[PDB]
Amino acid sequence: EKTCDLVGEKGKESEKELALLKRLTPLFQKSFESTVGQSPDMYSYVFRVCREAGQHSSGAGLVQIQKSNGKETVVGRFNETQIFQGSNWIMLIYKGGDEYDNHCGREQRRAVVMISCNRHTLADNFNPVSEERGKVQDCFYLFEMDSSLACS
Amino acid sequence: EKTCDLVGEKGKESEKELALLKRLTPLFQKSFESTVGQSPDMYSYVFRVCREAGQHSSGAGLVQIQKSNGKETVVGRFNETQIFQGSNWIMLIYKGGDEYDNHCGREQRRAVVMISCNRHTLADNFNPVSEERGKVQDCFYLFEMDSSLACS
Numbered sequence A, B: 001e002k003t004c005d006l007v008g009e010k011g012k013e014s015e016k017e018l019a020l021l022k023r024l025t026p027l028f029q030k031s032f033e034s035t036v037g038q039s040p041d042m043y044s045y046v047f048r049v050c051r052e053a054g055q056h057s058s059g060a061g062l063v064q065i066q067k068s069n070g071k072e073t074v075v076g077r078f079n080e081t082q083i084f085q086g087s088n089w090i091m092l093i094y095k096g097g098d099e100y101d102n103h104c105g106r107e108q109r110r111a112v113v114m115i116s117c118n119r120h121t122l123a124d125n126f127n128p129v130s131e132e133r134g135k136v137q138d139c140f141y142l143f144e145m146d147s148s149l150a151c152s
């Protein structure tokens, strides 16, 4: 599809989530990236809101590129989106990423993005915070970003 | 004595989560309450970190008391805890609450607590933000709270 897909058959989706996706529409045409870590784990993270961020038309909402060997790993897909907000933040979650091999019980990767309110920018300061891969399940990659859209 | 239980058997639990729980130790002996809503949906929410919040020994970390009939409902149990942090926030989740009867595919209720950094207080401003009960699954109750412990 062209945009984010929420849980629930068409018509049985949360009115709250739908309204939030609409609120983030200005960000759809943007692309965000951040390179972090040192060899052999230097990565380049590419994140997009409800739009393809990879190069294989797999529906990746956020990908990780092994700088060493140009390996592209899907961290999360926008067809499995969850989104909710607090008083001055919005959390976006892309599930359905590529499966781990020797971690987290071979579960699919998932991307968690915490968008904090910042009245001075529409979108800025995207950066990978950490990766939790030491659990038997429910692992994830955490990212943060600023946006005036998360201000209520 | 009991405490928060993390996913996975002892020995294979996240050292990250284990460390976060210790960081929240000072809050274990505290109790938080907030009454919200309008009749007949007026509720009293009692929150406790890794300690019994209910008066029925159900292992509840957060309960919802219906002010009209005093009916106590478990929102989340501390034996099913998840916890992680970002730059200036910590998110705590209690799953395994009482099952919905006519919402969310009858799944168990869950509590999501967003703890924001506030260097002026150790713990304050516990506030029920909202309840997402219009999804086919993955519903939840959202709460917010301030704490110096969430400051990095």
Ligand SMILES: O=P(O)(O)OC[C@H]1O[C@H](O[C@@H]2[C@H](O)[C@@H](O[C@@H]3[C@H](O)[C@@H](O)O[C@H](CO)[C@H]3O)O[C@H](CO)[C@H]2O)[C@@H](O)[C@@H](O)[C@@H]1O
Pocket (backbone or CB within 6 Å): A040, A041, A042, A064, A066, A069, A071, A073, A099, A100, A101, A102, A103, A131, A133
């Ligand atoms: O549990 P997994 O699936 O074995 O690893 C998860 C881990 O993957 C990414 O990190 C990289 C890998 O650990 C590993 O990659 C290998 C290379 O791509 C290549 O040699 O081929 C192997 C066979 O497919 C790969 O396993 O080693 C890299 C170098 O240390 C490492 O960066 C990354 O997605 C990370 O976040 C995941 O946790």
Ligand SMILES: O=P(O)(O)OC[C@H]1O[C@H](O[C@@H]2[C@H](O)[C@@H](O[C@@H]3[C@H](O)[C@@H](O)O[C@H](CO)[C@H]3O)O[C@H](CO)[C@H]2O)[C@@H](O)[C@@H](O)[C@@H]1O
Pocket (backbone or CB within 6 Å): B040, B041, B042, B064, B066, B069, B071, B073, B099, B100, B101, B102, B103, B131, B133
């Ligand atoms: O999907 P459910 O199980 O139908 O409920 C969701 C909803 O439950 C809670 O709030 C209360 C309930 O909707 C409902 O409860 C009944 C009354 O308390 C009383 O007449 O006793 C019955 C015994 O079975 C109760 O089921 O109606 C209440 C009045 O409007 C309402 O407050 C609460 O947990 C809420 O957060 C959940 O979303």
Ligand SMILES: *[C@@H]1O[C@H](CO)[C@@H](O[C@@H]2O[C@H](CO)[C@@H](O)[C@H](O)[C@H]2NC(C)=O)[C@H](O)[C@H]1NC(C)=O
Pocket (backbone or CB within 6 Å): A058, A059, A077, A079, A080, A096
């Ligand atoms: C989200 O989109 C992906 C991309 O197609 C779906 O992919 C599953 O992809 C694996 C290969 O990576 C296949 O073996 C499966 O057969 C795929 N699904 C389908 C529908 O063909 C994924 O299923 C999608 N998730 C949801 C919830 O729709």
Ligand SMILES: *[C@@H]1O[C@H](CO)[C@@H](O[C@@H]2O[C@H](CO)[C@@H](O)[C@H](O)[C@H]2NC(C)=O)[C@H](O)[C@H]1NC(C)=O
Pocket (backbone or CB within 6 Å): B058, B059, B077, B079, B080, B096
């Ligand atoms: C968390 O605690 C609850 C409460 O003791 C556990 O639920 C008991 O769960 C078993 C199923 O495993 C049931 O047969 C009982 O009837 C339950 N009690 C209640 C109040 O529901 C739950 O299993 C525990 N979960 C974990 C992961 O330890």
Ligand SMILES: [Mn+2]
Pocket (backbone or CB within 6 Å): A100, A101
């Ligand atoms: Mn790998």
Ligand SMILES: [Mn+2]
Pocket (backbone or CB within 6 Å): B099, B100, B101, B102
């Ligand atoms: Mn009920």
